[PDB]
Design a protein around this ligand. Structure first.
Ligand SMILES: CC[C@H]1CCCC[C@]1(O)C(=O)C(=O)N1CCCC[C@H]1C(=O)O[C@H](CCc1ccc(OC)c(OC)c1)c1cccc(OCC(=O)O)c1
Length: 128
């Protein structure tokens, strides 16, 4: 499925090139530039365990997820990934536990040492 496609075809977007965060652009965004650090970003996402089991989706509450980019308000893979996106883009990310919830996890739904799949749609962003 989609996780396996990222494993097989994904671009390594980490600074360390350790395959910790892998990305495929699924829909090219029409936006010109990536958001700046600090900007308010508006996203819709689907989150799955590596095995494909759904754990959360913003589409279940019909509400975009909103955070400030690059401020450590979310897991490291998200700060890394969203920073590479343009407005309107949908990407798939595969995130090793070092760049997500590590040995601690996010219990009960996310276990220790989980590799996570996310589809992120960058709906919009506004300058810090
Ligand atoms: C099973 C995970 C669910 C649980 C219900 C809320 C969303 C959820 O956390 C999720 O789907 C998720 O895994 N997210 C949410 C979308 C952004 C990516 C990821 C996330 O970073 O969530 C943070 C978790 C807290 C966090 C923050 C910073 C971290 O590193 C610096 C970090 O590392 C382990 C962990 C998040 C942020 C804000 C709100 C939130 O949940 C809603 C709430 O608390 O009101 C969850």
């Amino acid at each position: 499925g989609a996780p396996a496609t990222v494993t097989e075809q994904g671009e390594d977007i980490t600074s360390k090139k350790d395959r910790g965060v892998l990305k495929i652009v699924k829909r090219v965004g029409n936006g010109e530039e990536t958001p700046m650090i600090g900007d308010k970003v508006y996203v819709h996402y689907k989150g799955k365990l590596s095995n494909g089991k759904k754990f959360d989706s913003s589409h279940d509450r019909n509400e975009p997820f909103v955070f400030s980019l690059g401020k450590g308000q979310v897991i490291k893979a998200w700060d890394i990934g969203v920073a590479t996106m343009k407005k309107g883009e949908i990407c798939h990310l595969l995130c090793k536990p070092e760049y997500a919830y590590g040995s601690a996890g996010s219990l009960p739904k996310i276990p220790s040492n989980a590799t996570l799949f996310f589809e992120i749609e960058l709906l919009d962003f506004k300058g810090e």
